[PDB]
Design a protein around this ligand. Structure first.
Ligand SMILES: CCCCCCCCCCCCCCCCCC(=O)OC[C@H](COP(=O)([O-])OCC(O)COP(=O)([O-])OC[C@@H](COC(=O)CCCCCCCCCCCCCCCCC)OC(=O)CCCCCCCCCCCCCCCCC)OC(=O)CCCCCCCCCCCCCCCCC
Ligand SMILES: CCCCCCCCCCCCCCCCCC(=O)OC[C@H](COP(=O)([O-])OCC[N+](C)(C)C)OC(=O)CCCCCCCCCCCCCCCCC
Ligand SMILES: CCCCCCCCCCCCCCCCCC(=O)OC[C@H](COP(=O)(O)OCCN)OC(=O)CCCCCCCCCCCCCCCCC
Ligand SMILES: NC(=O)C1=CN([C@@H]2O[C@H](COP(=O)(O)OP(=O)(O)OC[C@H]3O[C@@H](n4cnc5c(N)ncnc54)[C@H](OP(=O)(O)O)[C@@H]3O)[C@@H](O)[C@H]2O)C=CC1
Ligand SMILES: CCCCCCCCCCC[C@H](O)CC(=O)SCCNC(=O)CCNC(=O)[C@H](O)C(C)(C)COP(=O)(O)O
Ligand code: SF4
Ligand code: SF4
Ligand SMILES: [Zn+2]
Lengths: 174, 118, 198, 114, 386, 83, 112, 145, 340, 50
């Protein structure tokens, strides 16, 4: 089904109507009315520091590594978070901890390399690496953006309460 | 009408490779063997030619591996030994082909081991 | 399972013979794939003739060039596989005509047949190095002005051989051989077990 | 053997084209060094042109030579038309990069893989 | 050089990065030679080194104004090669977010067109509506733009419990917002002048230069790949293609405002008729297993591990699948060996063809005309440069 | 210092980095946290270990607490179970 | 009669039946040189003969537009002379001749 | 195999034992395929590993805990398709997709057995056999791995 | 304590030179950090200028190669921590205008002593101290003499500490070349003795830098007092005119007694904001370059000097006009060389 | 939430009711063609022309 967007007598009434449109700029005045109208509408802006634009639970934001309630870090170095990262951001090398368990000696997410796809959130079997809510982690130096296991684990501890609430809200969906 | 040239197609001059990596790079044409870990043979079918391995120094800031050799991760796959040899000659890389070695036929029969004699 | 409509598979097959008979000379293989598409494969010399017949034939009007691309099978003697995908607004359909070109054996240009190709042919030269005779203005489009090497060739390193940084001493941007701080980790992914073809 | 020609039927005819391009570049070097305010000497640049035109002196096949000038001509156009800002041109001179020695002892002293 | 003057890469007028080396006799343009590749990034070569699912995020970045519609084209393409088709609910979703995305692109194209022309209030009016839409993306995918929601076997996760209702409130009102822009530009005594009879493209020439988009539709050629070759469930909906006559910048514009209108008609339906069901194919072979299943069933873990680490393993073949992305025909020619990572993936960008036409459109035109024509082609340098 | 005791050393050429800026290390190291975890006594020969919370835990594994000699330890939680 | 065709550039052609009959008869003529059993000659002659048989048969252009499709009659005119141009081009091209050369062995084998 | 599981019932577990300092037998993984018991008897003459019991608790481990001490020992790792018993030194240092595999020669012994050195980011992670019909036909010594 | 040198030689590679460089922000400095960073050396740049000014140095260093530390000359503790983990210390602290809170002694002798002093306490393998060429303990300019005083002292705080002694330096952003070229504002360009009998031998900045860097990575230089000089000497007359030549601005060399002129230097010196000329500068300008009879610098340390005319075009280009901006050095006439 | 007078100034100046759609969100052989020729599209009944 198609439609003609712009597909198209001369009477004094008509012409006089058209001439007035050109002479007294009638349509131009119409446009001014629209903007005057909004001037009276409430502005939609938010005080940025005081009020924050709403983000729902799936917002990917900043990477964090979670820990079991007991205190044992969740990651068991299966290293498929490294395998599915599209940007090659996550670098993981591991060795058996004295406990005999399997843990990552080095876990480095290069956030400048990361494109925040959220697949790592997806891929982890123990769900140790999660996309944390925080989006405000702008840093003065490039090195700060590169993150080792200690920063991510620390990021995980700081935001664990909200991360747990967010995963709680969205796990049925996944 | 066609013209005659006995010159081995060498197109090293058009490929656009830095001089150092055309005269110092030896590539090996080999059919990949099978990780003994798995018994599947679908990765031992096509010939591959792989450039010689180069420096992989540790990075001071993060400890990540760092490489200065561009042709390192490149492994081209060629269906037959003849075609792979051709790629090396026209691109000017040195080649050292390794003959495919396929498992020799082995005679097996469940009845044979039941032989107390042997 | 996709909703295949055999009605199509047949009609396009029938056209494939039609074209094969109409141009016995250049068509080497004509095949209707399962996705249900059609691909007429032509000798490189038939570039001009086969396209023109499709652009200007009442029973096969293929007015617009959807795309011109060149896969590179290094094993294949003729490395590049120029593929031209064309669309029929009238009869509603698409046919792909694919030819083969080696590095130093140029293909004719179809800018005459479709001017859409003026840019894509420049794109194929810049990335793969195939040359197109009779092209109005063939010159690199996507790569840097001084780039050396054709990038999408399978034999070109991803990271490439040159990268740029600003040097104070010379107060100007300056190429240097690429030095990467974490090489591309080349995960081997192929599984040693195949899938019994249906 | 048995290969279809690209632009010339024989090295001889091909060489004709190389001569033309050399001339082109030779006549152009001075202009570029002035329209780009490059800090190089026309003589110096003209030697560079020679360098390149000979770097590929070994090619014996006619087809390879023909493409080489096509490509060469394209480079000329760019330079002549200011499309290539200085950064692009000076790159030819490899001014910033540190030259590497080719002496074996030199390499031994510096790199694992020479 | 007839005063050759690079339009320049840094120019508010030039979306993104465009050097238009133009030779202008005073204020008349004699020849426009657009330069491209200022945003080439390697998207086509990079994909060869990545698995099918880890190359999905590249498609969102190819033309990111239209974030998802692009993802649908790769999806469809990978589904065809596997001969798998998405579940019924997923199809409607893709059409729901497919259209929402069309609006997002048109709000971008119409309002950014005006900002270059000099009208700045339409952009702020509709960017607030855009904002509200982004929020749909975020509450469905997690990202405001660059979602990665439409994956090769359906969408990733069902809609949140409540989104449909809000994609209604918005739709119920957005119309008035389009109406307003109108009272500001459709009949402005001045919009018409700078747009009318500028960049007229004949019908035969538009097909010849491969325009394939509103640009064709604006010239009166009737072609909407969504009606001619239906993809997903765009067949079950009913919409009217907005064909145009006297094709020129003004007419095509009117067409883009009309598809904003028609997309609200398609969105309404999708909300009215979206089926109960699953949002991803049930073949653990192609779609990753649900996390409750992979954590309780061995076959699901094995399928989760192999899918994320190795990949789909698409059967060998090649396909060109084209949808009707907001800009025009977006197609992926995806050649594929039996491997889990693709072999080639030429992205046909509605935009590589349109820019080429800049020369044949802007002839004997003033500097300001060139600015108007780049706007009427909705050039996003990501798709052109790829 | 850290988990695997990273100690850029007094003579390293990298310890230079922390000068005027602190290092990222962890309190409540995990190495000791599960060791601080009580041994989950059980009646059955074999026991499961969802990690706690099902979908929000680890792929469920069944541990054989069959020998008091050894408290089975799920390879995922490091939780010792006392038969 | 009509005011204008949908397509922007195309212009209404008065005496459309006459214009088509001129073009259609010409093509038939050019095809007369093609080799006798040439595939293009037999196929296009069949298409063109049916087209003008319909053009001669129908005196109403609107029904003529329905009978040979073609959308507007003006397009059919463009398609016919486009074909007339190619018919002249193919006579020079001589596509009826045997295949230029066989493809190199394994040139068309996709699994690789 | 199959897209999904129907085993809504419970699983079994066996008890990890010590087969030595080289092979980590997390044998709850075992698919009772008896290739170990063969190799350990046919390729190497150890004849120690054996099946014990019947039913679904047939566990293929040494009845008394006697370590599997023999050369040719590490091959069991390579020959068990399941990861029940795997290498203890290379326990968790890597994961195979990452390992870049370079084909080289055994220098520890004079048989010159062919071997593949699996290197990740520039340090060798494992050396596993690659087949040479004449010299080492898929097997390598405990020393050279 | 060392770092095996791995890599191919460019950025993102390692050379194993951790080096504190206290006055890096300087014209010479900028260059020193450039090569050190190019080579891949670890560079610690102490700074007391604001962070905005130190930004230019960030980009030439690779990620983690450059570390910036807050440091105050009067505060001994700041120097202490800077050299804590460095094994090479390079001192480029210098100024031409005695500032209100820092005297020539401080910038040349006092501070550069404390620095090397700590460096020893730290155990740095080598210290490179830079003092101006022809620096007698009796030279007229307080600056030169004071510098001489330093090169002695630092020996006692740090024995076998290399002491490169550069001539006035030729480079973009240098004074030697720009100063004269900027005399344009002055209608007349005073030149003591009408610019005669003060033969001068300039040296390209890079040559100096490369030389300095090479010192850091060579055992041959210990206690050495190298003198980077140049590829050709010049009577100040040709230099001045040549400059004006490339700048394409007229030249009126005017004789003016150094007596009266020392006074002009005093006048600018009076100015609060970085006096443009310095009574000492004036004297230094006229102090004739000394001939070479000392430890060879360039070439000896591995870099062949670069003639002034070669790169002059780049340094003096900014001073040309709308059209003169397009002239090149070889159509221009190079001035004669007076060895005297 | 705006005085009706100010709100009116809005509706009047605009010419439609913004109150209804507010900016503040609240809680021999045959010649064979490739496929049968496409049927020309029907005029949209709900609005054939704008
Ligand atoms: C001029 C006469 C007063 C104009 C006036 O008050 O405007 C609001 C008043 C109602 O406008 P509105 O858009 O419905 O106000 C939004 C809410 O109803 C009312 O908004 P609200 O719910 O936020 O009410 C609380 C508000 C109440 O504040 C006020 O309404 C008084 C503002 C006085 C401005 C003078 O107080 C504040 O929020 C803090 C700001 C107080 C005034 C800030 C500006 C003062 C400017 C002083 C220099 C001029 O405008 C008029 O009555 C007509 C004024 C003439 C129009 C032409
Ligand atoms: C001026 C008005 C400013 C306020 C505009 C917004 C509120 C009114 C909105 C009305 C609307 O939207 O429709 C417009 C309408 C829209 O008209 P139209 O385009 O529908 O055409 C009307 C004519 N027919 C229908 C026959 C074609 O325009 C008018 O009503 C007439 C406007 C005449 C303007 C003449 C020029 C301006 C006045 C110049 C004289 C001086 C006046 C006083 C100057 C200052 C003195 C202190
Ligand atoms: C006895 C005489 C009786 C009256 C005779 C007619 C007098 C007319 C006076 C105004 C003349 C306007 C004019 O000449 O038109 C120019 C242009 C409109 O031209 P256009 O409609 O495009 O058609 C031109 C070709 N026919 O004008 C335009 O529309 C473009 C102007 C653009 C600038 C903004 C226009 C809107 C301004 C709104 C505020 C105007 C306030 C005027 C009063 C200020 C306060 C006193
Ligand atoms: N042509 C030349 O300049 C020649 C120089 N030399 C010597 O070489 C050295 C380097 O020369 P150049 O770089 O031009 O000198 P500069 O005038 O550029 O100063 C060098 C550095 O020293 C720092 N500095 C100066 N005063 C102090 C202070 N009181 N406390 C701490 N830091 C200070 C400055 O930093 P900031 O400005 O941030 O305080 C500056 O970055 C000089 O010491 C000079 O004596 C020798 C011969 C010729
Ligand atoms: C400063 C300005 C920079 C401009 C640099 C320039 O653009 C880049 C450049 O010259 S690109 C050089 C490539 N130019 C060729 O490749 C020609 C090769 N021509 C042949 O090989 C002949 O066929 C022959 C065999 C006769 C050679 O034999 P001969 O010894 O030269 O005689
Ligand atoms: S996937 Fe989750 S668990 Fe496995 S490694 Fe990456 S993070 Fe650690
Ligand atoms: S081989 Fe591995 S799996 Fe087969 S039985 Fe011996 S151990 Fe169990
Ligand atoms: Zn557990």
């Amino acid at each position: 089904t198609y439609k003609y967007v712009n597909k198209k007598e001369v009477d004094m009434k008509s012409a006089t109507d058209n001439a007035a449109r050109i002479l007294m700029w009638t349509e131009l005045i119409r446009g001014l009315g629209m903007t005057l109208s909004y001037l009276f509408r409430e502005p939609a802006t938010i005080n940025y520091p005081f009020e924050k634009g709403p983000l729902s639970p799936r917002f990917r934001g900043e990477h964090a590594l979670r820990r079991y309630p007991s205190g044992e870090e969740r990651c068991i170095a299966c290293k498929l978070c490294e395998a599915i990262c599209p940007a090659q951001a996550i670098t993981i090398e591991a060795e058996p901890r004295a406990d005999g368990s399997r843990r990552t000696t080095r876990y480095d997410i290069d956030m400048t390399k990361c494109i925040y796809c959220g697949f790592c959130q997806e891929a982890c079997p123990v769900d140790a690496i999660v996309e944390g809510p925080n989006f405000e982690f702008s840093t003065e130096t490039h090195e700060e953006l590169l993150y080792n296991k200690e920063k991510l684990l620390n990021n995980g501890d700081k935001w664990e309460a909200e991360i747990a609430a967010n995963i709680q809200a969205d796990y049925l969906y996944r | 009408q066609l013209i005659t040239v006995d010159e081995k197609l060498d197109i090293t001059t058009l490929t656009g490779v830095p001089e150092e990596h055309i005269k110092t790079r030896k590539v090996r044409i080999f059919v990949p063997a099978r990780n003994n870990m798995q018994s599947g043979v679908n990765n031992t079918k096509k010939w591959k030619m792989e450039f010689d391995t180069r420096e992989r120094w540790e990075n001071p800031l993060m400890g990540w591996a760092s490489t200065a050799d561009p042709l390192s991760n490149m492994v081209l796959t060629f269906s037959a030994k003849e075609d792979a040899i051709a790629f090396a000659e026209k691109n000017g890389w040195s080649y050292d082909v390794e003959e495919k070695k396929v498992p020799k036929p082995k005679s097996k029969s469940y009845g044979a081991n039941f032989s107390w004699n042997k | 399972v996709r909703p295949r409509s055999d009605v199509t598979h047949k009609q396009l097959s029938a056209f494939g013979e039609y074209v094969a008979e109409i141009l016995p000379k250049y068509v080497q293989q004509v095949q209707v794939s399962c996705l249900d598409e059609l691909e007429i494969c032509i000798h490189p010399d038939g570039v001009i003739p086969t396209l023109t017949f499709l652009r200007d034939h009442t029973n096969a009007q293929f007015k617009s060039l959807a795309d011109l691309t060149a896969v590179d099978v290094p094993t294949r003697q003729n490395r590049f596989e120029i593929v031209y995908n064309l669309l029929s607004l009238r009869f509603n359909s698409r046919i792909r005509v694919k030819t083969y070109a080696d590095e130093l054996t140029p293909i004719d240009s179809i800018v005459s047949v479709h001017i859409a190709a003026n840019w894509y042919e420049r794109e194929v030269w810049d990335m793969f190095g195939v040359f197109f005779f009779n092209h109005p203005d063939l010159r690199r489009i996507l790569t840097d002005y001084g780039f050396e090497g054709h990038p999408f060739r399978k034999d070109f390193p991803l990271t490439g051989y040159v990268e740029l940084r600003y040097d104070d001493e010379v107060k100007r941007v300056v190429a240097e051989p690429v030095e990467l701080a974490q090489e591309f980790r080349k995960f081997d992914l192929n599984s040693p077990w195949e899938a019994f073809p249906a | 053997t048995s290969v279809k020609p690209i632009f010339s039927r024989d090295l001889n005819e091909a060489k004709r084209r190389v001569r033309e391009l050399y001339r082109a570049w030779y006549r152009e070097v001075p202009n570029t060094v002035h329209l780009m305010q490059l800090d190089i000497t026309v003589k110096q640049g003209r030697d560079k042109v020679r360098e390149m035109f000979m770097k590929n002196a070994h090619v014996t096949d006619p087809r390879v030579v023909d493409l080489l000038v096509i490509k060469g001509k394209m480079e000329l156009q760019e330079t002549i038309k200011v499309w290539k800002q200085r950064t692009h041109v000076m790159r030819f001179f490899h001014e910033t990069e540190t030259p590497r020695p080719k002496d074996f002892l030199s390499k031994f002293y510096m790199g694992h893989d020479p | 050089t007839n005063m050759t003057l690079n339009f320049g890469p840094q120019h508010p007028a030039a979306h993104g990065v465009l050097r238009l080396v133009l030779e202008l006799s005073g204020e008349m343009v004699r020849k426009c030679d657009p330069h491209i590749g200022l945003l080439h990034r390697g998207t086509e070569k990079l994909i060869e080194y990545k698995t099918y699912l880890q190359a999905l995020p590249y498609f969102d970045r190819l033309d990111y104004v239209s974030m998802m519609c692009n993802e649908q084209a790769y999806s469809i393409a990978v589904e065809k090669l596997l001969n798998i088709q998405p579940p019924p609910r997923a199809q409607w979703i893709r059409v729901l977010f497919g259209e929402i995305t069309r609006i997002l692109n048109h709000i971008m194209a119409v309002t950014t067109h005006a900002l270059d022309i000099g009208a700045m209030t339409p952009f702020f009016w509709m960017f607030e509506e855009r904002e509200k839409m982004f929020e749909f993306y975020e509450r469905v995918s997690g990202a405001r733009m660059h979602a990665a929601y439409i994956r090769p076997g359906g969408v990733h996760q069902d809609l949140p419990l409540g989104l449909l209702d809000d994609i209604y409130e918005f739709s119920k009102n957005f119309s008035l917002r389009i109406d307003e822009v109108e009272e500001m530009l459709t009949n402005n005594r001045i919009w018409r002048n700078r747009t009318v009879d500028i960049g007229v493209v004949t019908a035969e020439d538009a097909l010849n230069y491969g325009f394939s988009g509103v640009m064709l539709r604006g010239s009166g050629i009737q072609w909407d790949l969504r009606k001619t070759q239906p993809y997903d469930v765009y067949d079950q909906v009913e919409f009217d293609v907005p064909i145009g006559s006297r094709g020129d910048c003004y007419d095509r514009y009117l067409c883009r405002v009309e598809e904003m209108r028609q997309s609200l008609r398609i969105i309404e339906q999708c909300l009215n008729k979206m089926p109960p069901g699953e949002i991803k194919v049930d073949d653990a072979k192609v779609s990753p297993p649900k996390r409750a299943e992979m954590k309780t069933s061995m076959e699901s873990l094995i399928h989760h591990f192999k899918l994320y680490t190795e990949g789909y393993q698409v059967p060998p073949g090649a396909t060109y699948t084209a949808i009707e992305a907001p800009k025009g025909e977006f197609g992926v020619y995806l050649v594929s060996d039996g491997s889990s990572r693709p072999y080639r993936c030429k992205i046909k960008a509605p935009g590589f063809a349109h820019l080429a036409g800049l020369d044949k459109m802007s002839k004997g035109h003033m500097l300001a005309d060139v600015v108007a024509i780049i706007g009427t082609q909705d050039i996003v340098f990501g798709e052109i440069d790829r | 210092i850290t988990h695997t005791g990273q100690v850029y050393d007094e003579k390293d050429y990298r310890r230079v980095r922390f000068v005027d800026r602190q290092k990222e290390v962890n309190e409540n190291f995990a190495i000791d946290l599960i060791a601080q975890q009580p041994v989950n006594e059980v009646e059955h020969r074999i026991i499961a270990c969802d990690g706690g919370g099902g979908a929000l835990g680890h792929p469920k594994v069944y541990i054989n607490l069959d020998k008091e000699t050894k408290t089975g330890t799920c390879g995922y939680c490091g939780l010792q179970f006392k038969q | 009669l009509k005011k204008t065709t949908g397509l922007v550039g195309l212009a209404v052609c008065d005496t459309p039946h006459e214009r088509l009959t001129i073009l259609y008869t010409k093509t038939l003529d050019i095809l007369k040189h093609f080799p006798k059993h040439a595939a293009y000659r037999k196929y296009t002659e069949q298409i063109t003969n049916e087209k003008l048989d319909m053009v001669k048969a129908e005196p109403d252009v609107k029904k003529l537009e329905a009978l040979l499709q073609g959308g507007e009659v003006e397009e059919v005119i463009l398609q016919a002379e486009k074909e007339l141009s190619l018919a002249r081009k193919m006579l020079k091209w001589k596509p009826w001749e045997p295949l230029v050369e066989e493809p190199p062995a394994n040139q068309w084998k996709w699994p690789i | 195999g199959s897209d999904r599981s129907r085993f809504l019932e419970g699983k079994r577990a066996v008890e990890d034992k010590n087969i030595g300092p080289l092979v980590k037998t997390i044998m709850t993984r075992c698919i009772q395929c008896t290739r170990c018991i063969r190799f350990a008897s046919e390729i190497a003459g150890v004849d120690d590993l054996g099946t014990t019991g019947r039913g679904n608790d047939m566990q293929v481990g040494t009845y008394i805990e006697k370590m599997f001490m023999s050369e040719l020992s590490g091959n069991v790792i390579d020959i068990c398709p399941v990861g029940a018993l795997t290498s203890k030194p290379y326990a968790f240092t890597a994961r195979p997709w990452e390992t870049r595999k370079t084909e080289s020669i055994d220098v520890m012994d004079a048989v010159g057995s062919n071997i593949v050195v699996s290197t990740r980011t520039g340090e060798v992670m494992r050396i596993l056999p690659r087949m040479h019909e004449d010299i080492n036909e898929e097997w390598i010594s405990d020393k050279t791995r | 304590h060392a770092v095996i040198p791995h890599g191919k030689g460019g950025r993102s590679s390692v050379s194993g030179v951790v080096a504190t460089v206290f006055g890096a922000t300087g014209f010479l400095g900028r260059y020193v950090v450039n090569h050190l960073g190019r080579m891949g050396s670890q560079v610690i740049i102490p700074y007391r200028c604001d962070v905005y000014d130190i930004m230019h140095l960030r980009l030439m260093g690779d990620l983690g190669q450059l570390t910036f530390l807050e440091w105050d000359a009067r505060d001994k503790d700041s120097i202490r921590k800077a050299v804590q983990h460095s094994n090479v210390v390079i001192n480029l602290i210098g100024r031409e205008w005695e500032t209100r809170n820092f005297d020539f002694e401080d910038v040349f002798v006092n501070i550069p002593r404390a620095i090397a002093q700590a460096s020893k306490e730290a155990g740095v393998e080598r210290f490179i101290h830079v003092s101006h060429l022809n620096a007698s303990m009796k030279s007229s300019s307080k600056s030169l003499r004071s510098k001489a005083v330093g090169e002695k002292e630092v020996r006692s705080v740090f024995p076998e500490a290399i002491i490169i002694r550069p001539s006035d330096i030729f480079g973009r952003e240098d004074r030697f070349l720009n100063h004269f070229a900027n005399y344009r504002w002055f209608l007349a360009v005073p030149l003591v003795s009408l610019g005669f009998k003060t033969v001068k031998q300039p040296v390209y900045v890079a040559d100096v830098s490369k030389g300095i860097v090479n010192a850091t990575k060579d055992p041959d230089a210990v206690g050495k007092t190298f003198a980077f000089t140049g590829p050709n000497r010049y009577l100040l007359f040709h230099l001045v005119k040549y400059i004006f030549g490339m700048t394409h601005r007229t030249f009126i060399p005017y004789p003016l007694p150094l007596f009266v002129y020392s006074w002009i230097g005093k006048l600018f010196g009076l100015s609060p904001f970085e006096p443009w000329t310095t009574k000492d500068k004036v004297e230094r300008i006229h102090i004739s370059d000394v001939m070479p009879t000392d430890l060879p610098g360039l070439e000896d340390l591995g870099v062949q000097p670069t003639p002034l005319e070669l790169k002059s075009i780049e340094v003096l280009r900014r001073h040309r006009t709308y059209r003169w901006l397009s002239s090149e050095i070889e159509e221009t006439k190079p001035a004669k060389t007076v060895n005297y | 939430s705006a005085t009706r007078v100010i709100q009116k100034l809005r509706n009047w100046a605009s010419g439609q009711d913004l109150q209804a759609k507010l900016q503040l969100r609240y809680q021999e052989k045959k010649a064979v063609t490739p496929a049968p020729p496409m049927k020309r599209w029907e005029l949209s009944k709900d609005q054939p022309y704008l």
